[PDB]
């Protein structure tokens, strides 16, 4: 068997896109800072037992090119035998790294692995790496490429989520993120970013707007309306979804995920590896699953992935205490909740990317560590972590508190 356990899960604060505190910080420095923090917590751990470092990254170019995971292994003084591999599965990259690390542990061929992600969107913007699905006409034309934001407006149109509905969820996210920070829910897992002198750079999620009002969200302009009309992507989406006459553009900057910088790190190993290193297991990876749904609407992957990981674990929705789904767009969360009838009290209980930001490659590992803390804080049992993925993909993971 060789069960996989999470021994540590940490992240940086998320720095905003415009005049952000982390814009001066190299993406490599964000990862090394977290490695240094893991050394503070276990200074006598034999790092030669760490066999790999797996980092998700959606734009692996420039500062994030050249296998940034191996750069982090070397720049941090980690053992030269500790590996280092970059991967990209769009928004689920950070969670795919955790899933891959847990599966390498179960195989018996790896004993102790670092997993996580990094994305500095203020320095390396989304789409910097190119891609055939968007830029190659034959591929673009055949798969009916529609940017995510329009797929998110399509979900609200199909399901009947109004502008007030998605803005209501956005307000709730700002509130729960503010309550989580005020209550000290994040104090032990958000590692402040400091410079090479020890001086503070950022210690909090500066994208949050805790004073958001329902009225203030109502004044915001639909962000994806100038992109849909001038690009003709609306007409492309409705050729596939021919029973929908008009797309209601409900999503703005206030009910979508924020563009932020950040990194996350998770330490995964077997029970023998943790006992040998004096580590205490915080949770156990129950099961993982990859699935997907229609790539035109792009953002309906979480529901098949969640149902698949639940069937694999022999569990139902009622067996899960906390559901954490990335807040790429408000209608994606409302859709996922309506699909599986999730009690609102279980869903993104400490807030999400709408308030705190969505650093693509790191987000999956951030919200996973968020769930390890909250399961322990509430003394609850099981959590399910999932993310919507560009191209219609889906990834879901069930963890159990230990």
């Amino acid at each position: 068997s060789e069960e996989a356990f999470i021994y540590e899960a940490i992240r940086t604060p998320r720095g905003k896109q415009k005049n952000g505190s982390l814009h001066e910080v190299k993406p490599l420095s964000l990862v090394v800072g977290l490695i240094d923090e893991l050394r503070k917590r276990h200074p006598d751990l034999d790092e030669n037992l760490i066999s790999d470092v797996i980092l998700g990254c959606v734009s692996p170019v420039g500062d994030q090119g050249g296998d940034i995971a191996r750069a982090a292994v070397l720049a941090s003084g980690m053992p030269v035998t500790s590996g280092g591999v970059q991967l990209n599965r769009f928004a689920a990259s950070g969670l795919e790294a955790v899933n891959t690390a847990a599966q390498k542990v179960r195989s018996g061929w790896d004993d102790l692995v670092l997993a996580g992600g990094v994305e500095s969107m203020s320095r390396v913007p989304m789409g910097s790496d190119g891609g055939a699905m968007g830029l190659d006409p034959a591929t673009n034309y055949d798969v009916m490429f529609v940017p995510q934001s329009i797929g998110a407006d399509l979900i609200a149109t199909i399901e009947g989520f109004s502008r007030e509905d998605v803005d209501a969820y956005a307000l709730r996210s700002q509130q729960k993120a503010a309550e989580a920070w005020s209550g000290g829910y994040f104090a032990k897992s958000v590692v402040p970013v400091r410079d090479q002198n020890g001086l503070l750079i950022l210690d909090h999620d500066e994208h949050m707007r805790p004073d958001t009002t329902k009225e203030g969200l109502a004044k915001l302009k639909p962000a994806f309306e100038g992109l849909a009309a001038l690009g003709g992507f609306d007409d492309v989406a409705l050729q596939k979804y021919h029973w929908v006459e008009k797309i209601n553009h409900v999503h703005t900057g206030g009910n979508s995920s924020g563009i932020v910088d950040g990194a996350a790190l998770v330490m995964i190993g077997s029970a023998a590896a943790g006992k040998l290193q004096g580590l205490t297991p915080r949770a156990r990876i129950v099961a993982t699953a990859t699935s997907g749904a229609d790539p035109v609407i792009m953002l309906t992957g979480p529901t098949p992935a969640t149902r698949k990981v639940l069937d694999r674990a022999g569990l139902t929705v009622d067996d899960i205490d906390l559901f954490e789904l990335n807040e790429a767009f408000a209608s994606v969360v409302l859709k996922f909740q309506k699909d599986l009838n999730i009690p609102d009290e279980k869903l993104n209980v400490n807030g999400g990317a709408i308030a705190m930001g969505h650093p693509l490659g790191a987000t999956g590992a951030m919200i996973l560590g968020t769930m390890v803390d909250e399961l322990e804080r509430r003394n609850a049992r099981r959590a399910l972590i999932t993310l919507c993925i560009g191209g219609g993909m889906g990834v879901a993971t069930i963890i159990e508190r230990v």
């Binding site: 190119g130 490429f145 003709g232 492309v236 021919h242």
Partner: protein, 723 residues
């Protein structure tokens, strides 16, 4: 190798200065066409340029026909099967190898464009380093391969993208096969210089070579993309500016084509962008592989069959009576100044025919001439016409409110209300007034010509001349043969349609003729689906993705729904009067319900769509509850096929019954008259060219038709003539 025992089509001439003049003059035809004779003749000519390069200083490509060079060999391209893809690939590679060698001789090559340079013709001139065109009227320049289901496979895609960049070459030149006047071509950059007469072309070409050698000796004969510091206009796909808007090029194309299965524009855009990512020669080969992909496909064969062979068989007189001669038209009398009559008076005067536009009142007759005024003014501001052409032809239109003013007319075209009792008296009050052998045409959409003809004395000159609104934009004229209609009357009207620059089809008298009857089956299927519970959004999407220019429910709002009601009443009076029981179409129930709700289309303010001050809005929100839309969700292809197959089957019945006499008139009449999707090649070509999960051809059409009949009604059973 520059080669693949034919004749030679290129004449060689080297002057004392070392300039060679390649004069293209195919002896087997009236124009220069990219045939096997050309490929071998250009191969020898290019070989000799390379062999004699030590005594050659420049090249001038000229022509001996009225036109420079006109496209490729359609008779060969239409026979290319998928197993001939290697022969297609090799052929266009050979053609481009010759042009690429001509392009990199290290010497200036000038194209002397005297007449039209279309498709392969322009591609030859694009391979030169300088293009001079004679500013002669009628000289067209462009790459219209997309209109035949092809792409410019002789370097047209590769070179225009190199000259203009991906965006400008696709939108302006490639995607629509736009034809350009010489002044237009000089403005966009397809041509560099203009000369007044064709006699100045070659001397200007030789003068330009001598000046280019003196002024720019280092770069003489070097295209801009063969220099080290070449920058593609608008950037390459990897530059950040173009890569930001590049993902919107296929989506906008998908929006323009409305999802219709036309693969040529997709291939052009793919070849254009993939070519801009690599060197010129590699780009050219990519362009060849996409060209072979189109030629061996069915859609390109459909469009070649319709827009080349069928259209040429029509313009040659395939439906014209093969024994009659010529009869001139000195004056034309138009009855009715409405949307139809005013437009008919325009295109007739536009060709220089004297018109007496008669309406009841001189104020309405002047408003009929005012339709030409709004067109003469809108055409003047656009600079299309100006110098007295509009004013003199607008003077030829003589409004009149008196029937006596239609004196000396030898060609009557009545475009008044479709009421037989009205048309009987209107013609009776006019036949004694106009010339004895005058043609008596009647613009009608339903009423049979044989019945209308019984109101005149000389029925041999009575005939149906069905125009399509707007008359100035629609190209089809449906000529309906009455039982008493003489063959001379048909020839006189056939010649008139070619005179006004329109395409004619000949139809024997029958209920609904060809266009109105076949388009009826199209809207009846859509109205049936709405009553069945199919979402109206899906019905409109099925119509647009089929390739129709207007979705059916929108089309049913333009065609007055009250007008559709009394057409069914006229048909029910044909069977119930003959004793047989009428089998009503279930679409009639949907019409009556929308009539009952007071939504009879756009004309009465609201129909299937909502309307606000002449601007069509979205679908009526009450439509879904009224017909319980959503209770039936058939596959989208079934919706598309029900509309396409209904018109296809109805076309075959018209061919069986003798309504149409040829599949050429069926294909072109369906495309130009009722908006049948061009990628099909026509309602008759759609049968022989159908391609679906059953196969390809008549046999696959029959099985799919029998499959549609088993799930939607026996009306989809194919006739015996297809079995």
């Amino acid at each position: 190798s520059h080669h693949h025992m034919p004749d030679n089509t290129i004449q060689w001439d080297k002057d004392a200065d070392g300039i060679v003049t390649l004069t293209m003059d195919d002896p087997s035809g009236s124009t220069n066409v990219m045939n096997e004779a050309y490929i071998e003749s250009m191969g020898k000519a290019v070989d000799r340029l390379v062999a004699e390069k030590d005594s050659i200083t420049g090249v001038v490509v000229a022509s001996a026909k009225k036109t420079f060079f006109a496209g490729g060999d359609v008779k060969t391209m239409i026979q290319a099967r998928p197993e001939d893809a290697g022969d297609v690939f090799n052929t266009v590679e050979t053609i481009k190898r010759q042009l690429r060698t001509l392009e990199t001789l290290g010497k200036p090559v000038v194209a002397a464009i005297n007449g039209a340079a279309l498709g392969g013709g322009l591609e030859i001139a694009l391979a030169c380093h300088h293009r001079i065109a004679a500013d002669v009227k009628g000289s067209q320049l462009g790459l219209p391969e997309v209109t035949l289901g092809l792409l410019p496979g002789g370097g047209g895609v590769t070179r225009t993208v190199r000259m203009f960049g991906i965006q400008n070459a696709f939108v302006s030149v490639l995607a629509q096969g736009t034809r350009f006047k010489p002044a237009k071509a000089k403005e966009i950059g397809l041509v560099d210089e203009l000369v007044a007469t064709v006699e100045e072309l070659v001397p200007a070409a030789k003068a330009w070579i001598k000046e280019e050698l003196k002024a720019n000796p280092d770069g003489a004969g070097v295209q801009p993309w063969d220099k080290k510091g070449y920058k593609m206009p608008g950037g390459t796909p990897s530059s950040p500016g173009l890569a930001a808007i590049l993902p919107s090029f296929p989506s906008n194309l998908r929006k323009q084509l409305k999802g219709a299965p036309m693969p040529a524009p997709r291939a052009i855009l793919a070849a254009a962008v993939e070519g801009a990512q690599v060197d010129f020669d590699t780009a050219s080969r990519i362009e060849s592989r996409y060209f072979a992909s189109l030629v061996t496909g069915q859609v390109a064969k459909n469009m070649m069959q319709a827009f080349f062979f069928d259209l040429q068989a029509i313009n040659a007189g395939g439906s014209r009576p093969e024994g009659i001669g010529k009869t001139p038209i000195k004056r034309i009398g138009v009855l009715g100044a409405g949307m139809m009559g005013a437009g008919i008076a325009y295109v007739s005067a536009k060709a220089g025919y004297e018109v007496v536009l008669k309406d009841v009142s001189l104020e309405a007759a002047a408003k009929g001439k005012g339709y030409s005024e709004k067109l003469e003014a809108k055409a003047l501001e656009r600079g299309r016409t100006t110098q007295e052409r509009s004013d003199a032809l607008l003077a030829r239109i003589t409004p009149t409110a008196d029937a006596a003013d239609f004196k000396g007319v030898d060609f009557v075209i009545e475009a008044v209300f479709e009421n037989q009792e009205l048309k009987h008296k209107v013609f009776g009050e006019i036949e004694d007034i106009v010339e004895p052998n005058a043609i008596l045409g009647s613009n009608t959409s339903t009423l049979p010509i044989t019945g209308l003809a019984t109101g005149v004395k000389r029925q041999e000159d009575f005939i149906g001349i069905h125009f399509f609104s707007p008359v100035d934009k629609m190209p089809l004229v449906e000529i309906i043969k009455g039982e008493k209609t003489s063959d001379e009357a048909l020839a006189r009207v056939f010649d008139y349609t070619l005179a006004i620059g329109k395409t004619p089809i000949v139809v024997n008298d029958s209920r609904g003729f060809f266009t109105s009857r076949v388009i009826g089956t199209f809207v009846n299927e859509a109205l049936a689906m709405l009553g069945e519970g199919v979402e109206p959004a899906s019905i409109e999407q099925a119509g647009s993705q089929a390739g129709y220019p207007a979705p059916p429910l929108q089309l049913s709002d333009e065609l007055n729904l009250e007008l559709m009601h009394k057409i069914a009443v006229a048909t029910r009076k044909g069977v119930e009067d003959a004793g047989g029981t009428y089998q009503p179409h279930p679409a009639e129930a949907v019409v009556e319900k929308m009539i009952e709700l007071g939504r009879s289309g756009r004309l009465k303010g609201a129909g299937f769509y909502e309307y606000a001050d002449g601007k069509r809005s979205g679908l009526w929100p009450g439509l879904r509850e009224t017909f319980k839309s959503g209770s039936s969700q058939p596959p989208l292809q079934d919706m598309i096929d029900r509309m396409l197959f209904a018109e296809a089957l109805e076309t075959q019945k018209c061919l069986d019954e003798g309504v149409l006499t040829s599949t050429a008139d069926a294909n072109i009449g369906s495309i130009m008259g009722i908006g049948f999707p061009p990628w099909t090649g026509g309602s008759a070509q759609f049968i022989v060219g159908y391609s679906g999960p059953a196969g390809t051809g008549k046999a696959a059409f029959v099985a799919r038709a029998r499959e549609l009949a088993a799930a939607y009604g026996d009306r989809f059973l194919p006739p015996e003539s297809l079995l």
